[PDB]
């Protein structure tokens, strides 16, 4: 404990993960668990999964010190195609739906606060995404200016919700007593529950690039993933107890803006409005921060042969230093996704899709341990086979449980991942344009 070099990194770990997740997901988690008790474990196990996932992905992250992440872990053990399919889905599914989902949910909350028509959600989701894509092409003056406040004023609506929520007048241990209900049976439920809590835990993957950047890693590096994601774990459980102290299972699942309602009970008048402003900020900072780290992918495929208009995609505008053309493609496919999907449907794709490759990455660490067990390992996954296999065990479990629950979602991501198999090979002989 107390290394000082890494309490700075720990900031990141908490910040990368924490955001707009807890503020909107309960609606899904309780609408699937059908009981407070089962939903509350899903946040714990998903968290215990990613503390697992995070430590396994750091070994491959230290073998390959790079900011590219996965795009390169997967080429390096699974060949140029999987280095590609990773990015192809990142560029066509993951980034566009993460803009999309969040922009939708924003508008949703905007209409909830400034009590407006529930028709005018999509136009607002369009215009936030269109605005923030545009604003990002102005430069990292503004993009980053949104980010700094978005990190200050995402922790305050929480610390204010936990304090008061846990202190709610009608409340205590009884406010989570139905553990597993028969209307929502445990197995079908825990699969739709984990995939909804795992969206809140998202961005934990960035630990590979973090460990890449590290200097003399092990010293405190595992403590930073342990401590980091367990502070996130700690928070995500504690603010849920607060939500269940005010409302409960049926009620949370009821409005698609859960935290916003618990706000309006916890505080009367503008007090609770100041909390929802904090939420709309938290959502907007994510949208923007996703765009920010989104423009990186189409460009890295434009770095290689991998994309049809590689020259147009790789264009960094000499003014801003950003490949805006990647984001104009991602704005389009995000906009189709806002008009075609529904927030939870989308936030589900995202967990399924990414974990299809994330698994591969952990599997890869164990592969790597047998391909070149003489490569240099600055950080090595502790309790060696246990935890990567834990992450795999839980990883595998999601991709099978989403298949079997959401067959359409499992196919939209699969249609769109495998629509890139032709793409890859067209522009490998031709090399793009």
């Amino acid at each position, epitope marked *: 404990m107390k290394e000082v070099s890494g309490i700075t990194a720990l900031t990141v770990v908490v910040g990368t993960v924490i955001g707009a997740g807890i503020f909107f997901k309960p609606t899904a988690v309780y609408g699937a668990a059908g009981a407070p008790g089962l939903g509350l474990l899903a946040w714990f196990v998903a968290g215990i999964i990613t503390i697992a996932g995070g430590l396994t992905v750091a070994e491959i992250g230290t073998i390959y010190p*790079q900011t590219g992440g996965m795009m390169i872990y997967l080429e390096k053990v699974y060949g140029r195609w999987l280095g590609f399919l990773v990015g192809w889905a990142q560029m066509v599914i993951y980034y566009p739906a993460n803009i999309a989902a969040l922009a939708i949910i924003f508008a949703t909350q905007f209409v909830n606060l400034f009590a407006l028509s529930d028709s005018t959600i999509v136009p607002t989701a369009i215009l936030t995404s269109i605005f923030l894509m545009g604003v990002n092409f102005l430069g990292t003056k503004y993009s980053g200016w949104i980010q700094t406040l978005a990190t200050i004023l995402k922790l305050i609506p929480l610390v204010v919700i936990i304090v008061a929520g846990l202190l709610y007048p009608g409340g205590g241990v009884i406010r989570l007593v139905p553990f597993s209900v028969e209307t929502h049976p445990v197995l079908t439920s825990f699969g739709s529950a984990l995939i909804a809590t795992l969206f809140a835990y998202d961005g934990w993957i960035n630990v590979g690039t973090l460990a890449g950047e590290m200097k003399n890693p092990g010293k405190m590096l595992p403590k930073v993933i342990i401590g980091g994601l367990s502070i996130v774990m700690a928070v995500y459980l504690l603010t849920n107890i607060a939500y269940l102290f005010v409302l409960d299972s049926s009620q949370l699942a009821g409005t698609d803006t859960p935290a916003a309602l618990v706000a309006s009970h916890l505080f009367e008048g503008i007090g609770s409005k100041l909390v929802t402003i904090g939420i709309l900020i938290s959502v907007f900072g994510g949208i923007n921060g996703y765009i920010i780290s989104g423009l990186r992918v189409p460009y890295a495929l434009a770095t290689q042969k991998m994309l049809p208009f590689s020259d147009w995609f790789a264009r*960094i505008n000499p003014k801003t230093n950003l490949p805006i053309n990647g984001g104009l493609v991602m704005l389009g496919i995000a906009i189709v996704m806002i008009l075609t999907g529904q927030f939870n449907q989308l936030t589900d794709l995202i967990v399924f899709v990414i974990w299809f490759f994330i698994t591969l990455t952990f599997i890869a660490v164990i592969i790597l341990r047998k391909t070149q067990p003489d490569i*240099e390992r600055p950080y090595r996954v502790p309790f060696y086979p246990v935890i990567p296999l834990i992450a795999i065990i839980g990883g595998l479990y999601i991709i099978f449980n989403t298949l079997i629950v959401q067959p359409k979602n499992a196919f939209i991501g699969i249609l769109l991942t495998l629509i890139g198999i032709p793409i890859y090979f067209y522009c490998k002989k031709k090399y793009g344009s």
Partner: nanobody
Amino acid sequence: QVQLVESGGGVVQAGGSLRLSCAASGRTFSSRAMGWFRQAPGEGREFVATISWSGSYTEYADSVKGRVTISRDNAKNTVYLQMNSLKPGDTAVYHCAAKNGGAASNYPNDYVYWGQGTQVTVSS
């Protein structure tokens, strides 16, 4: 506080070979990832190479893979770019940049310190 100065690149012949050098401020170098980028007089920047702090990871762009080789001498705070089999579509100012942390980057925006760049002209 990290000054970088490029060396070597001038007029060269097709198929020929050119070693580029980039001298950096010091201290911070050994802990920093490096990389070269090239800027043609119609385009913006473009990824060429990048190397880990320890020099373990290395990554080159599609058009220069196989020809060029990036390398660094942390003892003499320098990063090299051993280009070979040069084509006249290489011709551009090769700026050498620095960023923070060991992880190498193909992204120009990661890079915070940037050099003036040395002009290269490959001809026939």
